[PDB]
Structure 1
Amino acid sequence: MAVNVNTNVAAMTAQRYLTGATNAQQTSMERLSSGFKINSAKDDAAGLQISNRL
């Protein structure tokens, strides 16, 4: 790798980490607004099942 004019791999890494942080931020906002740690089964499936049974 050397001087490069048409692709920005460092920008790509920045965007990937930015989108990851954005996902995490939305999950945190959803958890805070709802008050529930488990809103979808992708959070905790077995936890969702046991909490629903309870």
Structure 2
Amino acid sequence: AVNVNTNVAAMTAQRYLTGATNAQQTSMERLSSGFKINSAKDDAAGLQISNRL
């Protein structure tokens, strides 16, 4: 059916665009800093050992 109140395609494309944008932001932070461990979210365990090293 064709409806104008809602657009399922619009919601899905937006969601995958926000996920892709999040991937772009986390990646670009990695190159600029040079570290793949910039916050506990990336790796909580890996951050702890790395700081100990």
Q: TM-score range by the shorter chain?
A: over 0.9
Please name the residue that 2:12 is paired with. Answer: 13
Structure 2: distance between partners of 1:19 and 1:37: 21
TM-score normalised by structure 2 residue count:
0.97
Q: How big is each residue's C-alpha offset from its partner over 1:1-54, in whole Å with a ceiling of 9 and x where there is no partner?
A: x11111111100000000000000000000010000000000000000000000
Unmatched segments (≥5 aa) in structure 1: none
Unaligned 5+ runs, structure 2: none
CA RMSD of aligned residues (A): 0.5
Total equivalences in the alignment: 53
Mapping 1:41-52, distance limit 5 Å: 41-52=40-51
Q: What is the TM-score when the length of structure 1 is the normalising length?
A: 0.95
Partner of 1:24, secondary structure, is helix
